[PDB]
Every structure is written in C-alpha cells, then in structure tokens.
Amino acid sequence: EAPAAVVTGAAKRIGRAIAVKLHQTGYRVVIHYHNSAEAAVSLADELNKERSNTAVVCQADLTNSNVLPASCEEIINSCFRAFGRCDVLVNNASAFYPTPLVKTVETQVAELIGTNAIAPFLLTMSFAQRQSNLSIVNLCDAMVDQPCMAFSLYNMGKHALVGLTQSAALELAPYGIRVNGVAPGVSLLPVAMGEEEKDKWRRKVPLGRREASAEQIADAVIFLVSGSAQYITGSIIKVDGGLSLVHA
Amino acid sequence: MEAPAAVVTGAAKRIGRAIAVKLHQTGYRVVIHYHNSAEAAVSLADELNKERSNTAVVCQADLTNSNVLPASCEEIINSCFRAFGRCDVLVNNASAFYPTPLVKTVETQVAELIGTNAIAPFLLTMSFAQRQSNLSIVNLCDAMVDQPCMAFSLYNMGKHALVGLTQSAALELAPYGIRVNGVAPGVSLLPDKWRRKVPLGRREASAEQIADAVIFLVSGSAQYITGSIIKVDGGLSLVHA
Amino acid sequence: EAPAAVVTGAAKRIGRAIAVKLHQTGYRVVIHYHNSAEAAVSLADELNKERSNTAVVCQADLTNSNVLPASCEEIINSCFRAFGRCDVLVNNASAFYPTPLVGKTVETQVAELIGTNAIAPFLLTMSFAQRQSNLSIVNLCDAMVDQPCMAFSLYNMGKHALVGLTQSAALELAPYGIRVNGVAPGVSLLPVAMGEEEKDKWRRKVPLGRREASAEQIADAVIFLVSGSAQYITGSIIKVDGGLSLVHA
Amino acid sequence: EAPAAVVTGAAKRIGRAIAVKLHQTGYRVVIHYHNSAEAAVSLADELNKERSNTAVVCQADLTNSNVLPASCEEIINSCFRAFGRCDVLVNNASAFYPTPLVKTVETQVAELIGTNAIAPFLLTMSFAQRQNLSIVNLCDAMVDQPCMAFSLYNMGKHALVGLTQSAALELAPYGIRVNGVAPGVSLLPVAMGEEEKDKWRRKVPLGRREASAEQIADAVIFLVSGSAQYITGSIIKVDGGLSLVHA
Ligand SMILES: NC(=O)c1ccc[n+]([C@@H]2O[C@H](COP(=O)([O-])OP(=O)(O)OC[C@H]3O[C@@H](n4cnc5c(N)ncnc54)[C@H](OP(=O)(O)O)[C@@H]3O)[C@@H](O)[C@H]2O)c1
Ligand SMILES: NC(=O)c1ccc[n+]([C@@H]2O[C@H](COP(=O)([O-])OP(=O)(O)OC[C@H]3O[C@@H](n4cnc5c(N)ncnc54)[C@H](OP(=O)(O)O)[C@@H]3O)[C@@H](O)[C@H]2O)c1
Ligand SMILES: NC(=O)c1ccc[n+]([C@@H]2O[C@H](COP(=O)([O-])OP(=O)(O)OC[C@H]3O[C@@H](n4cnc5c(N)ncnc54)[C@H](OP(=O)(O)O)[C@@H]3O)[C@@H](O)[C@H]2O)c1
Ligand SMILES: NC(=O)c1ccc[n+]([C@@H]2O[C@H](COP(=O)([O-])OP(=O)(O)OC[C@H]3O[C@@H](n4cnc5c(N)ncnc54)[C@H](OP(=O)(O)O)[C@@H]3O)[C@@H](O)[C@H]2O)c1
Ligand SMILES: Nc1nnc(NCc2cccs2)s1
Ligand SMILES: Nc1nnc(NCc2cccs2)s1
Ligand SMILES: Nc1nnc(NCc2cccs2)s1
Ligand SMILES: Nc1nnc(NCc2cccs2)s1
C-alpha cells in the first residue's frame, strides 16, 4: 500500500535528509550509497526501527563506465525487489571538485559527468522502463550560470542535468511521470572546507547570511513529489536564499 | 491575533479565488481585493466568514496605473492591518490580459497592462514592506514569458517587468526577512487547441493547482526560497514550435 | 541612397558612439536628445561636416505621458522628413537611478524609468513599423538584468520589460522583414556622477581585463546586428559584458 | 603573420562554411574531419589554390574514450606544427540522433556527450595550455525546448553551454574569449524529405526558411573579430526567432 523511493547518495547530508523526510511522509526507501556503508546501514536501521521493512540499502559506484547501465538498472531493481514498486527517483549523488583548464582527466570526466548526469539519465531510463503519482527529482545547482571558477567539468555535469530534467519531463509526461529539479545554492558546506571560507559563502546569502539546512532542501523535494505538484513538470525550484540574484 | 493574514488581488474569481480559499483553509485571514466583481468578492467573503467568522474582508480598487494608484495600493495593505492587525502575505494575482498589436487609447492599454501586471505589484510591495514571522510575497507570473503570444507585447512587457520585480524585491527585502517568489502558470483556466499542446495530460491546470504552489511558497516549507519562480505549466514551456 | 537610422539619447556617451559608428558605415542619422541640446547639435555639425545633409537632431522627452505616443511618432517622422526613409531604430535612451522599496513622486519615477526604458521603445517600435532593404531595431538592454543592483527595482522592471519587448516585437515583426535584437552592456561608461574609487570597484569585477566596455565596443555590437552579417538574427540579445554576468557573489 | 584557426567537423555543411569564411578573413585553417576525408581534402585543396599553404586536414574521432585527450591534444598541436600558432578554436563537430528513454547506450553516451561536450572541453584545455585569442562553440538555440527523445544530445548541448560559460570565466585572465553561436534550424539532414524540411522551415518567423551555413558562419566571424573584443561568455542565437515560438 505505501509508495517507494530511491534516493542516490542517501547516506549523508542532503540525500539523507531527503530519505528521512520521504520516510516520514509514508515512503519506503532505498538508500543508495557508494563508500559510506556504515552511515547507510545505520540510517536504514533507524528507519526500520520506526516502521519495519521500510528501508533497504543499495551499494553502487555511479562513475561512468561500460557497467554503469547495469549498476543503475540494479538500483532501480533493488527498489522493486524490496517493495514491489518504485514511485519516486531522487538523483542526489554527486562528485564535486575542481578541474582547471590550465586522477586522469578521463577519470575526472567519468566521475563528474557520470555521477552528476549520466547516472541520472540511466536511472531515469531504468525507472521508466520498469513502470499513481510517479516522479523524478534531480538535484541541480542554483549557481549553474555563475559557476565556481575552475569547476568546468562539474558545471558541465549540472548543466547537462538541467537538460535531462527538461528532456525527460517532456518525453515521460505521456506516461504520467513528472520530472523536476531542486537547485541548492549554498547548502551544507564541504566537510573539507575551513570555517573562514564557510562564513565567506554564508555572508553572500541575502536571506539570513547562512547556508540551507539539508531539511530545507528536502522540503522542496517533498513538495515536488507530493499531490500538490501534480501539474508541475520540467520545473527547477531554486532553494538558494537569493544567492543567484546577487551580482559580483 | 496569532492567525496570520493575507492580501490577494483579483480574488473574486478563477485563480485568485482559489488562492484565497486555499489560504483561508490553511488558517489565514484574507483581504479579497476586487475591481468590478463586487458580487463575487462579497459572496466568497460570505462563504469564508461562515466557516470562521471575521476572517475575510473585501477591498475595492482599480489597479490601472494613475496618479491615485499609489494611494489605492497603500489602502489595500492598510485594510489588512485594519481588519486583522498584521499582513503576512501579499499575493499579486490581478491581471489585465488582451492583445496590443504593434501594426482604448494606447496609453490606456499601457496603464492597465503595465499597471495591473507590474506597477500595482511594485506599489503593493512597497506598502507591504514599509508597514513591517513568515513574511512573503508571491507574484503571479507567466510560464510563457519567453515564448509569448503573438501581438501581446504590452502584456508580455508587464509580465517580464513582474519577473524583474520578483527578483529585485527578493534581493532588497531579504534583509527584512520578506521572501519574494513567483508562480508561473501556463494554460490554466481559459478566458481545446491549447489543451492538446500540454505534455502533462493534455488539460489545463486547475486554479487549485496554481494555488497549491502558492501555498507551498508561503509555507514554512519554503523558508529558504526567495527569488524563485515555480512554473506550473504541465511542461508546456518545454514544447518547441 | 544611403540608409537612415534613429538613435535615442544620442548626444553623448554610448548613444553618440552608436550614431557615429552608424554614420561611418554610411547611415544618415537622427540624433534624438532630451536635455543635451548643445552636445547633440555639436554632434550633428561634426557629422554633417564629414558629409552634407547626413545628420539632424530631434528633441523629445521620453517620459511616459499621454503625449508620449505623439513624441515617438514625431521622432520617427523626423527621420522620414529628413531622409525619406527609416531603416534602423536604436532604443538607447535610458533613465537610471535608485527607487528603494523601503525628490520625485513615485508616479514620476515610474513614468521616467518605465517610460524611457520600455514604453518609449514600444511606441517607437510601433511607429517605426507602421511608417514602413535591411530593416532592424536594436534595444540597449542590461546584461545584469537578472542580478540587479539593490534598490533599482523600477529601473530593473523597465529593462526586463525591454527584454520582453525585444522578444515580442521580433516575433510579431518578423513577417514584415523587421528584425529586433538587443545589446546588453555589463559595465560600460560609468556614471559621470560616480567617483573614481566607486568606478574602480566595478572595473575590478570584470573578468575580461578588469575594465568597463568602451562606448565603441558597445557600438560595434549594434553595428553587427544592423548589418547584413546578422540577416537571420532576430530576438537575440548579445551581452557585451566581459564575463561580468557570469561572476558569482 | 596570418592567424590560425582549428574548425572541428569542417569538411561539410556548417563547419565547411566556417572554415571558408575564416579563410576569407585571412585565417590559415586546420580542417578537422572524422569520416569525411574526401570532402575535407577537397576543401583544403580549394583553400590552398586560393593561398598556398593555408589549409591542412586533421583526422580524428571525437567520441569519448581513453584516447580522446591525446586526440584533442593532437588536433591543437597540428595547428601549431602547421602554422606556428593557434588563435581560434571552433567547436563545431556534433553527433545528433535520438536516444529514447523508453549502438549500446554507452556508445551513445560516448558519441553524443563526447562530440558535443567532452571533446570541446579537452580541445579547450589543450588550446589554453598551449598559449585576439578566442573559442566559439556551436550550441543549439532550442536547448530549452528540445526535440522529444533526444535526451543525450540535449544533455551534451546543455553541457556545452556550461563549458562556454565556465571557460569564459576561467580563461578571461589569459585574454582568451569564449562564446557560442546557437543555430535554430540551419542546414537540414541530407535524407530528410522536402515535405519534412518545409514543416521546420514554416515554423521560422523570419522568412520561413532555415539559416544558411554562411549565416551561422557570419556570427562566428563576428565573435572572433576585433569587433567583439569585450564579448565573452555570450551565446548568440542565429535562429530567425524560432526559439521564441510557443507550441
Ligand atoms: N551542499 C551544497 O551546498 C550544494 C550546492 C549545490 C548543489 N548541491 C547538490 O545537492 C545534492 C546533494 O548535495 P551534498 O553536498 O549532500 O552532496 P555530497 O555530500 O557532496 O555528495 C552526496 C553523495 O554523493 C555520493 N557520491 C559521490 N561520488 C559518487 C560516485 N562515484 N558514485 C556514487 N555516489 C557518489 C556520495 O556517497 P558516499 O558518501 O556513499 O560515497 C556522497 O555522500 C548534490 O547533487 C549536489 O551537487 C549541493
Ligand atoms: N489562467 C491562465 O491560463 C494564466 C496563464 C498565465 C498567467 N496567468 C496569471 O495568473 C493570474 C490569475 O489568472 P486568471 O486567469 O485567474 O486572471 P484573470 O481572470 O484574467 O484576472 C483576474 C482578476 O484580475 C483583476 N483585474 C483585471 N483588471 C483589473 C484592473 N484594471 N484593476 C483591478 N483588478 C483587475 C480582475 O478583478 P475584478 O474581476 O474584480 O474586476 C480579474 O478577475 C494572473 O496574474 C495571470 O496573468 C494565468
Ligand atoms: N553605461 C553602462 O555601463 C550601461 C550598463 C548597462 C546598460 N546600459 C544601457 O546602455 C544604454 C546607453 O547607456 P549610457 O550610460 O550611454 O546612457 P545614459 O548616459 O545614462 O543615458 C543616455 C541618454 O538617455 C537620455 N534620457 C534620459 N532620460 C530621458 C528622458 N526622460 N527622455 C529622453 N531621453 C532621456 C539622455 O538624453 P539627454 O542627455 O539628451 O538628456 C541621456 O543622455 C542605456 O539604455 C543603458 O541602460 C548601460
Ligand atoms: N544544422 C542545424 O540546423 C543545427 C541546429 C542546431 C545546432 N547545430 C549545431 O551546429 C553545428 C554544425 O551543424 P551541422 O548540421 O553542420 O553538423 P553535422 O553536419 O550534423 O555534423 C558536423 C560534423 O560533425 C562531425 N562528427 C560527427 N560525429 C563525430 C565524431 N564521432 N568524431 C568527430 N567528428 C564527428 C562529422 O564529421 P565527418 O563528416 O568528417 O565524419 C560531421 O560532418 C553542430 O555543433 C550542431 O549541433 C546545427
Ligand atoms: N556535490 C556537491 N555539489 N555542490 C556542492 N556545493 C558545495 C559548495 C561549495 C561552496 C559553496 S557550496 S557539494
Ligand atoms: N489575466 C490573464 N493573464 N494570462 C492569461 N492567460 C490565459 C490563457 C490561457 C491559454 C491561452 S491564453 S489570463
Ligand atoms: N542608463 C543607464 N543604465 N545603466 C547604466 N549603468 C551605469 C552603472 C552603474 C554601476 C555600474 S554601471 S547607466
Ligand atoms: N549536429 C547537429 N545538431 N543539430 C542538428 N540539427 C538538424 C535539425 C534541425 C531541426 C530539425 S533537424 S545537426
């Protein structure tokens, strides 16, 4: 009777807040993870303590390669194995690091374009081929047109994800699958980043001079998958505190 | 007094009514603004006050641009403060819509099309902010703003100006904690060829579907969202010619 | 015969550079001005001294009012009275100043900021089209239209409206062979009013050379758009901003 | 000292026209090709007959693979070996075919994302590493109103927008400008029946025809010229208003 959702990169940070808030809403969840095995299992434990048999984990590398289609097929298949259905796909997993124009480059291309764009395409195809309020939500980037300097590949990946969001909204609408995006500006800052750099970014945000909580991002995801967004497809909701509006 | 309060312009019919109703159902007190639709405005106010008495008032004003528009807009915001003691939400919904081919005087067309669609929203936004917790404004935009209807230059200029206001006001009022966002319908309630162009189910949006996006944006679930415009268009804007 | 162009606010700065560059390419020019009468006449003189009977001036307030349509009709009429034709319209004139949401009356500011930046371009476009070869319109837009200066809401509304006009008019006049495009400076000639230190703050933002656009660089893009090399281009807005619009906060 | 330009996919159609018009402006050219050797060589011969030793050909597959970075480095190097310099890169080559959601899919990924996005990135990096310098990328005016069932193609073209913007921003301190030209409907497929061609043509507000190759080429010539010295990160539509037309 309960719908089911796949969330990629759901062990930590935003994806985890997404999976949690989906579960709170009624969904059974596949918690996809790559390296964060302890966190993934520990999230699924917490969720199944609340409602037994409502969470499973699924391990996969989302780097592009000739087995990526199979991995993506397996993420979707795992949702069907555990819950008999797959109502929502959340494309959240993401590699993020600089690739200056001036790891081999082909690995960087595989990681940054694979995770951020190719895996979402492949997951979207498998989601669709396996098929009610069906929908996909892609995690985009509010700053996609005012990119971080030296992040060409990352940015290319997120731009492609906009393209996917739109193309798949158009193509899947006849099957009643909605496809939308949520575009954070500055949400949870990289664990790697020092606290002076974190406040630099925080200070740019017109609304409150702080980053988005992961929960604030999830809230937008929840709206998009909900029955209050039934006529919404191809839309990318910025959740950025106005940051994208701010000139240099 | 702890129930928040909303002003919705053009609230007597169609999308504005639906927005007023849904806000009221969420627990808002509402100012139902109207220009010509007195009977309808009052009838809605009646229905809502039957649900919860003294939660709905009406306010008449022409939103055409003129020398008296700033005072009319200021009095709309005042009416919310008079009735309810606070003004938490402004929904800029009223809109004039008609062709103005490039090939009523043109200056009257400017006054109604740019006035109702952009200038009144600007003035209402100014009065709303001057008078000031989850404070927000929602502007009713247009999903087809960049693929406009042929011969609708002034309407389109006004809806583009409204994107501008949405973004400018979001930036400038963020320090006051006033969020400013937009909802952009495609084809909603018609004023069949059109229905068939929509990817998502070959139908128009109900007014309620538009309202749903407004309710989201005013909610505590959108507390970090400002300067965003959510399309509610069933994919129509994605469809090439 | 030589083609003819109208340039609004052409007495000084970017408008002058546009009129000059159009005249150098072979156009006869109407130099529209509002307050800058000495500068406009002085410009027409210089151009006429390079080639007789190729420049006139035309004074008009482009503030919105009930007479704005007549004024815009008269601008276009001036070009047909002077040159027997009107091939190109450059909507360059612009009022620019803050209008904080939180001096002049607000209705005056609306009239100036929406009138000059949007309404007069719409009426001029209407007149240009109705009074009718490579016919085109170029609207001076703003590359920062989606990252606006704080407290510039009416100016920004006007520049957004002008984007809309650009697109609506390109759509609607394409059947008549009239192209409509835009040119969108980021930081070009800074306000005369602005102190050097404030100017250098803006300059420092620009990735491409950390300087503002020259007036000539803006004009070059106008000249492309009116040219035979832009015959298939309509509804395009070209940023001339040295990458400024791409820079995050 | 004549400047030098690399044009990818320069043997035919839009790329050919770009190469010709660059050559007419005074550029020496590297005509890059994949399968169209005879057309590429005939263009080179034509251009050399006009001015000796001003055109060379360079064969390379721009599909993504382990060797694409070396291929892209070789293209750029061929310009320097032939002409002693490389002033302009035009990323024009493109694969284009439907990839419905409902060749292996990874080969589709390699061809569509490789030609349209990864190869321009690699080329751009090699161009920059080796340094009026500018790059022009051939984008798509319909990128936000895509053809149904062209997700991978559209993804590639959106990525190219991101490249164009990202490279503009990063390369601006080295004085390298990076821009795009976005055709709407230009030269239609070779096989497409006229009746199908006319459905597309009829959609275009400005003259109900597709853009010539030369018309697209004109915008590229503008962007590489001294008249665009402050233009970077700009994408000029050359679409006859098509992108403005609602469904
Ligand atoms: N945080 C922000 O400020 C911000 C800003 C703009 C956009 N976003 C977007 O919002 C989404 C969530 O953001 P976030 O900061 O929570 O992301 P994140 O923590 O940087 O990454 C989320 C997860 O992606 C997974 N991932 C990385 N490489 C992968 C690979 N090769 N295969 C499979 N999974 C891989 C990781 O899983 P394991 O941990 O299991 O390895 C990781 O925990 C992302 O799409 C991001 O680009 C975030
Ligand atoms: N329905 C759609 O397909 C669609 C598409 C795109 C955008 N939108 C936007 O969605 C919003 C609501 O759409 P709708 O179809 O419900 O609107 P609508 O029925 O065209 O107009 C709504 C109300 O605006 C008020 N209004 C019109 N001219 C006025 C004036 N001079 N002064 C004061 N009020 C005036 C009227 O109030 P009185 O009746 O009291 O005189 C009218 O009932 C609008 O902003 C519209 O532009 C709608
Ligand atoms: N300068 C920049 O950095 C920059 C940046 C972004 C966009 N732009 C745009 O590029 C264009 C040219 O810029 P600019 O700096 O050269 O412009 P500007 O000097 O601010 O103004 C140009 C001319 O506009 C005319 N004007 C102002 N108010 C008017 C009115 N009420 N009636 C008629 N004319 C009026 C004036 O004519 P008189 O002198 O005769 O009175 C003035 O000389 C403008 O459209 C502007 O918005 C410029
Ligand atoms: N034609 C249009 O209406 C239109 C519309 C929108 C955008 N565009 C863009 O404008 C540009 C030029 O258009 P077009 O119609 O002239 O292009 P096209 O004829 O489809 O492709 C141009 C060339 O791309 C090369 N190419 C294809 N796959 C390749 C690979 N794997 N490796 C290396 N080269 C490869 C081919 O070279 P060989 O022949 O040598 O094998 C081909 O001649 C493209 O970027 C296109 O996407 C065109
Ligand atoms: N996977 C990720 N995508 N984008 C991210 N943004 C992290 C930020 C870095 C600086 C401001 S936000 S993590
Ligand atoms: N007031 C109004 N603004 N925009 C409106 N759109 C109504 C249309 C719906 C479908 C084609 S036109 S009404
Ligand atoms: N009329 C005018 N519109 N925009 C102008 N730009 C002037 C600038 C002010 C700050 C940076 S550029 S003048
Ligand atoms: N490589 C190519 N990219 N885009 C192309 N477009 C050809 C067509 C344009 C419109 C219908 S088919 S070829």
Nearest CA to ligand 8 atom 9: D185
- Do residue D151 and residue A168 have CB atoms under 8 angstroms apart? yes
Q: Which atom of ligand 1 is nearest to the CA of A143?
A: 6
Give the integer Cα–Cα distance in Å for C69 and C61.
11
Q: Which residues contact B64 (CB under 8 A, 6 or more apart)?
A: B96, B108, B111, B112, B115, B116
With 0-12 / 13-18 / 19 or more C-beta atoms within 10 angstroms meaning exposed / middle / buried, residue A71 is: buried
Cβ neighbours, 10 Å, residue A100: 12
> A233 CB near a chain B CB, below 8 Å?
yes
Instruction: Name the neighbours of C, counting chains with at least 3 Cβ pairs within 8 A.
Output: A, B, D
Give the integer Cα–Cα distance in Å for D147 and D141.
12
CA distances from C197 to A246, C179, D145 (A): 21, 40, 44
Is residue D92 annotated as involved in ligand binding? yes
The identity of residue D169, as a single letter, is L
Give the integer Cα–Cα distance in Å for A245 and C147.
5
Structure tokens given for A62 = 């989302």
> C199 CB near a chain B CB, below 8 Å?
no
> B239 CB near a chain D CB, below 8 Å?
yes
Give the residue before each break in chain B, using a C-to-N cut-off of over 2.5 angstroms; say none if it is continuous.
103, 132, 191
Is residue C21 annotated as involved in ligand binding? no
User: Is-contact C130 C177, C-beta < 8 A?
Assistant: no
Dihedral of the alpha carbons of D52, D54, D60, D66, in degrees to the nearest 10: 140
Task: Choose the closest CB to A170 out of D102, D117, D148.
Answer: D148
Query: Among B35, A157, B139, D188, which residue's Cα sits nearest to residue C153?
Result: B139
**Range of the structural domain that residue A174 is part of:** 1-248
Residues of C in contact with D234 (CB under 8 A): 238-241
Identify from C189, C236, C240 which residue to disrupt to test chain D contact, counting D C-beta atoms within 10 A and taking the largest count. Answer: C236
Residues of A in contact with B201 (CB under 8 A): 173, 176
Find tokens 């919860």 and name the residue. B52
Give the integer Cα–Cα distance in Å for C78 and A116.
57
> C204 CB near a chain A CB, below 8 Å?
no
Q: Which residues contact A242 (CB under 8 A, 6 or more apart)?
A: A205, A206, A207, B170, B171, B174, B226, B227
- Do residue A69 and residue D155 have CB atoms under 8 angstroms apart? no
Number of domains in chain B: 1
Residues of A in contact with B226 (CB under 8 A): 206-207, 241-242
CATH code at B32?
A: 3.40.50.720
- Do residue A204 and residue C249 have CB atoms under 8 angstroms apart? yes
- Do residue A247 and residue C249 have CB atoms under 8 angstroms apart? yes
- Do residue A163 and residue D174 have CB atoms under 8 angstroms apart? no
User: Is-contact C114 C156, C-beta < 8 A?
Assistant: no
> C148 CB near a chain B CB, below 8 Å?
yes
Residue C6: its H or E element: strand C4-7
Query: Among B192, B187, B223, B222, which residue's Cα sits nearest to residue B206?
Result: B187
Distance, CA of C31 to chain centre: 12
SS3 state at B134: coil
Query: Among D9, D113, D10, D37, which residue's Cα sits nearest to residue D68?
Result: D113
Residue B210: its H or E element: helix B207-218
- Do residue A223 and residue B216 have CB atoms under 8 angstroms apart? yes
Long-range pairs for C142-145: beta carbons < 8 A, 24 or more residues apart = C142/C184, C142/C185, C143/C184, C143/C185, C143/C186, C143/C239, C143/C240, C143/C241, C143/C244, C143/C245, C144/A247, C144/C186, C144/C241, C144/C244, C144/C245, C145/B164, C145/C184
DSSP letter string, B40-109: HHHHHHHHHHHHSTT-EEEEE---S-STTHHHHHHHHHHHHHHHHS---EEEE-------------HHHH
Cβ neighbours, 10 Å, residue C49: 10
With 0-12 / 13-18 / 19 or more C-beta atoms within 10 angstroms meaning exposed / middle / buried, residue A52 is: exposed
Burial C157-186 (b: 16+ CB within 10 A, else e): bbbbbbbbbbbbbbbbbbeeebbbbbbbbb
Find tokens 């055109």 and name the residue. D55
Q: Which residues pair with C136 in a beta bridge?
A: C88, C179
Q: In what order do the strands lie in the sheet with B135-140?
A: B56-60, B29-34, B5-8, B89-92, B135-140, B178-185, B229-232
Q: Which residues contact C52 (CB under 8 A, 6 or more apart)?
A: none
Q: Does B101 sit in the ligand 6 pocket, CB within 6 Å?
A: no
Q: Given A27, A87, A141, A240, which residue is catalytic? A: A141
Find tokens 């371009």 and name the residue. C121
Q: What is the CA radius of gyration of chain A?
A: 17
Give the integer Cα–Cα distance in Å for D122 and D94.
15
Q: Do the bridges between strand B229-232 and strand C4-7 make them parallel or antiparallel, or are there none, so unpaired?
A: unpaired
User: Is-contact A167 A140, C-beta < 8 A?
Assistant: no
Find tokens 């997404």 and name the residue. A18
Structure tokens given for C4 = 């003819």
Q: Using CB atoms and an 8 Å cut-off, which of residues 118-137 of chain A contact chain D?
A: 118, 121-122, 124-125, 128-129
Residue of D nearest to C222 (CA): D227
Q: Which residues contact A199 (CB under 8 A, 6 or more apart)?
A: none
Give the integer Cα–Cα distance in Å for A30 and A5.
6
